[PDB]
């Protein structure tokens, strides 16, 4: 038999620190039983396991827990995330591969691999002879590598004829977009 | 909850038996640091962040002690209801497009981990590989399970086959996820 307890402190930020919401969670195994939520303003029992806990936490800790919206959430964001997490900029690498061996008049997929970028915001577009492609484009979910970089693969359904295909990538880390060409 | 950014601060896990604890911060879903509880040291995922930002480990040790206490109270109050073992799910993918002869990293992403005890190991041609490997902390999920990533740095070759092997109490047999160029 194994037993687990978790505590989660969560600071949600909108428009910098103009809007902050603090949520703390007390969890037994995987059951959240007690929660503070700054939008509520007090602790509440989430399940019966926390029924008598919520009154005690409100009586003993509530002023400190509310104060943490400023002393922890706002402080950590303005003083420490602004100069580290929020200024990190990693430029994407862009490569194009064909899914299947190239054959005239045969269906294929062009894959634009966009890798190692940060932050997550990115715009990837496929072009054919300068014409943006709408239908036949698909994308993997954004893949979190766990090392503070992302990757995404953007696919284009196509059929090689006779001409030129371009993957186009815009990202906050780039002064100008990246373009990579493939010729049929 | 919609937001532009999310910080996870004070994040603490404690488990018994075994006195297993973890303290982490995260920002927008990536690990800022964990506190090494044996060495009482803050270990930042990006070292340059920790050169600029101080986290005193005592704050992590205090939360760990409070969670050890809370684990004690809640196990008794639940009448010693034990954790349910989940079956983790694993996937392997490369960090960058694979080119023979060019260094790369295999990433074994393991999800639905609960309780947070696991053994993730790599095999090359069915033989254990440990040099250079590193893994993340247990990163929290919204459903209060965990995920973890392991990294194998390697040079791709046509003659090498890789597996990520995952052992966990919620698996009858070890999970083996294959990858090759």
């Amino acid at each position: 038999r194994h037993f687990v307890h978790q505590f989660k402190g969560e600071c949600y930020f909108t428009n910098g620190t103009q809007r902050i919401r603090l949520v703390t969670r007390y969890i037994y195994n995987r059951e959240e039983y007690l929660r503070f939520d700054s939008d509520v303003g007090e602790y509440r029992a989430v399940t019966e396991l926390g029924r008598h806990s919520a009154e005690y936490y409100n009586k003993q800790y509530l002023e400190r827990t509310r104060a943490e919206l400023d002393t922890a959430c706002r402080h950590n964001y303005e003083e420490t995330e602004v100069p580290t997490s929020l200024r990190r900029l990693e430029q994407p690498n862009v490569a194009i591969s064909l899914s299947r061996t190239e054959a005239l008049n045969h269906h294929n997929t062009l894959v634009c691999s966009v890798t190692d970028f940060y932050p997550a915001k990115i715009k990837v577009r496929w072009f054919r002879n300068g014409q943006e492609e709408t239908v036949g484009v698909s994308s993997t979910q954004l893949i979190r590598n766990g090392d503070w970089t992302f990757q995404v693969l953007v696919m284009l359904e196509m059929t090689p004829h006779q001409e030129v295909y371009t993957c186009h990538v815009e990202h906050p880390s780039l002064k100008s977009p990246i373009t990579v060409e493939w010729r049929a | 909850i919609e937001a532009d950014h999310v910080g996870f601060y004070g994040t603490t896990v404690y488990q018994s038996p075994g006195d297993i604890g973890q303290y982490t911060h995260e920002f927008d879903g990536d690990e800022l640091f964990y506190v090494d509880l044996d060495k009482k040291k803050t270990v930042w995922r990006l070292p340059e962040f920790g050169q600029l930002i101080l986290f005193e480990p005592q704050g992590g040790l205090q939360n760990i002690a409070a969670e050890k206490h809370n684990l004690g109270c809640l196990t008794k109050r639940s009448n010693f209801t034990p954790a349910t073992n989940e079956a983790p799910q694993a996937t392997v993918f490369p960090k960058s497009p694979v080119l023979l002869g060019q260094p790369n990293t295999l990433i074994c992403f393991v999800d639905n981990i609960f309780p947070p005890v696991i053994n993730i190991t790599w095999l090359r041609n069915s033989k254990s590989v440990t040099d250079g490997v590193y893994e993340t902390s247990f990163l929290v999920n919204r459903d209060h399970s965990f995920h973890k990533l392991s990294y194998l740095t390697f040079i791709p070759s046509d003659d090498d086959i890789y597996d990520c092997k995952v052992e966990h109490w919620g698996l009858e047999e070890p999970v083996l996820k294959h990858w090759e160029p």
Binding site: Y57, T71 | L32, C73
Partner: peptide, 13 residues
């Protein structure tokens, strides 16, 4: 510059 914990508070038992 220092980042701060959100504090785990103690259950009453």
């Amino acid at each position: 510059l220092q980042t701060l914990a959100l504090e785990v508070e103690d259950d009453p038992c």
